Amino acid sequence: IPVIEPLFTKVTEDIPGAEGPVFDKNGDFYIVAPEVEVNGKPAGEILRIDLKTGKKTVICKPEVNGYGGIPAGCQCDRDANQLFVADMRLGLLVVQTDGTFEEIAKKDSEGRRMQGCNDCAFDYEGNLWITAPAGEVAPADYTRSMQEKFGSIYCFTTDGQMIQVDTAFQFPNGIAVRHMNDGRPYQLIVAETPTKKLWSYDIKGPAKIENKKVWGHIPGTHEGGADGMDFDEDNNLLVANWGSSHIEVFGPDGGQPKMRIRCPFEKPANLHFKPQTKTIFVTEHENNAVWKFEWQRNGKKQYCETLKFGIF
Ligand SMILES: [Ca+2]
Ligand SMILES: [Ca+2]
């Protein structure tokens, strides 16, 4: 498998468990610090990063009734400049740029207790696909599916329903949606970290997924595996292989990576393209920092880059 070694440029440093890199509608950059804790208790943070200086600004430090959050993944909204944040302790959160936030759900559409989330991905229809590797949200005791298969997948629909679409995963992590050239969502990719697998489903409609399949295989026997992911404009899936020192590049049909990207660190966690560019921002847990490098082409437009009233 061909490996490239692009130049990685330092963006910012010292962010415990640096995760969920994301750009909002105004081009501002955000990162979440899930592993920040106070007195042994979760006290996760959501930060804005000044790309010109690397200076960090904590805009939100979510907590619900004394229970601190563990924000781990983000997606920017289209109709409003707000962030949808997967929180390992609080479920799904909607965070405004002013730092205020709201907890989306304590229970799912079936009345079942909500599970802590890790990452999410908006499809072009506005539906949010979320991975939930943690156990029940606070106030319940914190648990995570690294050893046992109790990780679930959710779809937070346009009509405000939090629907569980699948369960029994051993730490569902990264997640992405593949669209047809005309914009129709048709495939969901879900990373299952410890098992070194990438799972796929056919998206038949909002919160409707069928034909679960082992779509891709993540290299290595190291502890870790597929973490964050995103598609480039040609629908190549770039996957952060935590603990392998590489970002795997899968072709449209999956299977084995068709290319690997060597990182100057052992633990790449998550990534995100800068709108209209080939620039990919990467967070890593060896140094707990954020970097950037140039990929071969532009990223696939995120939902926040599309237009609700666009003609084409
Ligand atoms: Ca993750
Ligand atoms: Ca991303």
UniProtKB/Swiss-Prot annotation:
Effect on the protein of changing N270F: 100% decrease in activity
Effect of mutating W242F: 44% decrease in activity
Effect seen on changing Q75Y: 6% increase in activity
Keyword vocabulary terms for this entry: Calcium, Hydrolase, Metal-binding
Pfam family, one: SGL
SUPFAM superfamilies: Calcium-dependent phosphotriesterase
Catalytic residues (UniProt): H285 (proton acceptor)
Outcome after substituting Q75W: No effect on activity
Biotechnology: Has potential application in bio-remediation by detoxification of organo-phosphates used in insecticides or nerve agents used in chemical warfare such as soman, tabun and sarin.
Effect caused by changing Y142S: 8% increase in activity
Ligand binding (Ca(2+) 1): E19, N118, N173, D227
Temperature dependence: Optimum temperature is 35 degrees Celsius.
Gene3D superfamilies xref list: TolB, C-terminal domain
Impact upon substituting W242L: 62% decrease in activity
Protein's recorded name: Diisopropyl-fluorophosphatase
